[PDB]
């Protein structure tokens, strides 16, 4: 009956060792990367967690982390477009409108 | 979509390295090679006088002209630093020194 705990990582590629193909040498002993993986599965069966990962280089993610029962959903967040830019400016500029501080000219 | 633009000065070596076969098109950029062209370029830049231009045209009518715009600018700079009397003579002298013949 426990609630839900969410842990957000970032640039998870940093905890990867499969990025040394192009003279990266950015992989420390796989031990460290094994441990984290065996915290999303193992003999223990945690049932009240949700892990959201974020990255910028999708090509250097260790492959053992993209299988069923593990992080198993990919999605892309592309650049904004005209309508998105309009809406975002409108959002960011609500204050001056709320106080008339913005010029009517703009 | 995508587009790629390349540039080089030694095409033969690239041809030998079987790299040209990768590209899809070629373009040429020739050097100035005629006297009238040189006079037109000088006119467009506008740095030489009327009698000066006439003397230059008289002396350069031989048609043995072959230079690169860049080096033309550098020679013009070098020449302009003399006194007004010897500018044209010195410039013609340097021009003559660089007597290339492709």
């Amino acid at each position: 009956n426990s609630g839900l705990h969410i842990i957000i990582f970032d640039e998870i590629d940093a905890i990867c060792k499969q990025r040394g193909s192009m003279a990266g040498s950015t992989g420390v002993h796989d031990t460290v990367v094994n441990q984290l993986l065996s915290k999303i599965d193992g003999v223990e069966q945690l049932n009240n967690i949700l892990v959201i990962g974020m990255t910028n280089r999708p090509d250097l993610i260790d492959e053992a982390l993209l299988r069923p029962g593990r992080l198993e959903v990919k999605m892309e967040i592309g650049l904004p477009d005209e309508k998105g830019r309009l809406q975002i400016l409108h959002i960011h500029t609500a204050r001056m409108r709320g106080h008339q501080l913005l010029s009517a000219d703009v | 979509k995508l587009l790629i633009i390349g540039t080089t000065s030694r095409k033969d070596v690239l041809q030998e390295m079987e790299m040209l076969n990768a590209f899809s098109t070629t373009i040429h950029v020739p050097n100035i090679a005629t006297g009238e062209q040189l006079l037109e370029a000088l006119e467009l830049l506008g740095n030489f006088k009327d009698k000066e231009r006439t003397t230059i045209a008289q002396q350069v009518k031989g048609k043995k002209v072959w230079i690169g715009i860049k080096k033309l600018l550098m020679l013009i700079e070098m020449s302009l630093q003399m006194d007004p009397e010897y500018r044209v003579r010195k410039f013609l002298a340097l021009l003559r020194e660089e007597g290339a013949s492709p």
């Binding site: 040394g20 193909s21 192009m22 003279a23 | 030998e16 390295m17 079987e18 076969n21």
Partner: protein, 107 residues
């Protein structure tokens, strides 16, 4: 039954479409295990990385009952260049030993 391994090398002048025909032949096999080791997916690597990648691909291929592996553009793969010549003897020695190794019994 007495020839568990087979090989074939396709060739032709540039831009004749060897890759497409190879892909079509591979696709029309109905085999359960297919792969294509293409150079593009190794840009900027070091010969050791190439060797390890090929090792892994073939190791995985060993685990099935039928398979098909299409190593495309062998020329570029072996870092060639006319002048010299130059290349990486390691990769050559690798592929040459690998193209003759039979899989475990019954595959």
């Amino acid at each position: 039954d007495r020839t568990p391994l087979v090989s074939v090398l396709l060739e032709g002048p540039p831009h004749s479409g060897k890759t497409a025909l190879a892909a079509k032949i591979a696709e029309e096999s109905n085999f359960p295990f297919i792969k294509i080791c293409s150079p593009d997916k190794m840009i900027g690597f070091s010969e050791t990385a190439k060797c390890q990648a090929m090792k892994k691909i073939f190791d995985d291929a060993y685990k099935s009952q039928l398979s098909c592996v299409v190593v495309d553009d062998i020329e570029r793969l072996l870092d060639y260049v006319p002048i010299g010549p130059r290349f990486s003897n390691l990769v050559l020695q690798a592929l040459l030993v690998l193209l003759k190794k039979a899989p475990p019994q019954g595959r």
